[PDB]
Symmetry: C3
Subunit: 194 residues, 3 copies
Amino acid sequence: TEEWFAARLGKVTASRVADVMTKAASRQNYMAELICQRLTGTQEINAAMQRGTELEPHARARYIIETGEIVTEVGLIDHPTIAGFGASPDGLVGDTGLIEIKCPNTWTHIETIKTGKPKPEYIKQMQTQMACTGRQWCDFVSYDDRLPDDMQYFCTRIERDDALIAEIETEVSAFLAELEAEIEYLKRKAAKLA
Amino acid sequence: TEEWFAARLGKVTASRVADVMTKAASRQNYMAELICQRLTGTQEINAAMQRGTELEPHARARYIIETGEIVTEVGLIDHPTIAGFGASPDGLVGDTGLIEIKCPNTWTHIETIKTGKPKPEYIKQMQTQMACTGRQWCDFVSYDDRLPDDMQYFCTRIERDDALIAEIETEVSAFLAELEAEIEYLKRKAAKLA
Amino acid sequence: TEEWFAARLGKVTASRVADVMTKAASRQNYMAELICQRLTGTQEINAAMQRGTELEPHARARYIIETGEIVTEVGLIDHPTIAGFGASPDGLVGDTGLIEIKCPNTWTHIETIKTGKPKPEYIKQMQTQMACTGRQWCDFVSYDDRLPDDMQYFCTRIERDDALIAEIETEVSAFLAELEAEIEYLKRKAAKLA
Ligand SMILES: [Mg+2]
Ligand SMILES: [Mg+2]
Ligand SMILES: [Mg+2]
Ligand SMILES: [Mg+2]
Ligand SMILES: [Mg+2]
Ligand SMILES: [Mg+2]
């Protein structure tokens, strides 16, 4: 959409929380990205990513086939109290749940089946989605239709972790404080100069 | 072709033997590639590579001009005894020889002229091609038509090395054993689960 | 143009002087690039670079708006005494000055405003442009129209440094000596061989 981008402009999103918190160049690079979005009012513009995005509604359907859950789509949900912070789960499930879908490279999917666990960056993403929505768990789905039937679908439930959420909110608050100050600082300097 | 891909699907090929044997991330990454090919039944899809492929018949012609050898084209030749292993030389030469052609970047070609020796990964490729076909030598040709005439063409003969071949076959056997077990293992787990 | 490329073929240019002098792989990689250009008679062929090039006349206009200077465009200017060496400033300013324009990513522009100083590689570029033209200073302009008005335009003056220029000319002379010898060496070897 264009409303898709507009709702996300200048905000810390759940999909990037791992860049915020890691112990880093990725934190500073994301900070620079959000500074430029807020100042310029626009964001900067592969095969596997595109193929992935296009498969996600297949994955969504497969999950409902496998579970019988009522799934509603949702856009960006703002954090209830931290301004400039939001999350975009791939669905609201029932009254208290969520779904986050990955449709990655085949080997990444296989490694998820092997370990049974989502990458730590996706744990952060999903805890943040829970933070923003008030939900109690998120079913993490990995899906690859290239594989034999009994390997295409993987799902595991990640329960709300209030300790991790409090730590995320602390870090994201600190990061947003630095972001807003940097923008204020740059602006005051340019204004004085002019 | 489509038969080109089909003949190569799931197999260790001579062009990748160096990834098998190196002392590595490249061995594990190739293993993952072949696992996914065998499980999914399909393979995943630059200017210099394309330009190169298109020049190889010029190089083939230049070699025959320079040598007068009878060259026959050939597709994938399976190893006589190791299943799932094969080689695709760029030509059969005479009764007992082979040709492997490179059409690389100009500087890579120049460095080949300087040292007089093919990269070790290409020694492995050519010994494997000899392993698969039973041939006795392979003429390694590097060709770049962008250069002055007296620098365009390079050729050096690599004689069959039975010791290196036995070592290649040992490594490739071990690698294929792990590959097939991994596929069996994944399948048994998924089947039990379902 | 095509005359653009022709004037630059095989020459050390001001924009690459930093690769010549750094303490390196970049020196050897540039040397290889220039060897191949001289031998083959041709050179080898992103969004931000293209967007940048297209913005440079906006930046040029903004600079004249801001300063009132008379700016003339110029192509490649050969070093007065070092053969195979030249510079392409983005404009002659007045009788004694120059302009070098960057239209980079927004964050790079912001970092230039923060530090007030061009990257060391661009100091080398501009001292070389002064070396080639005999000029006395170069105004370094960074421009990004995506930003608020009071952050779009940055300019700082870099005065001719005769010590740095003598050191550049020494290094570039040594590099050109090695380049020409390498070409002579390769040619003599190929000629003897043929
Ligand atoms: Mg999501
Ligand atoms: Mg998703
Ligand atoms: Mg081949
Ligand atoms: Mg070849
Ligand atoms: Mg320039
Ligand atoms: Mg410029």
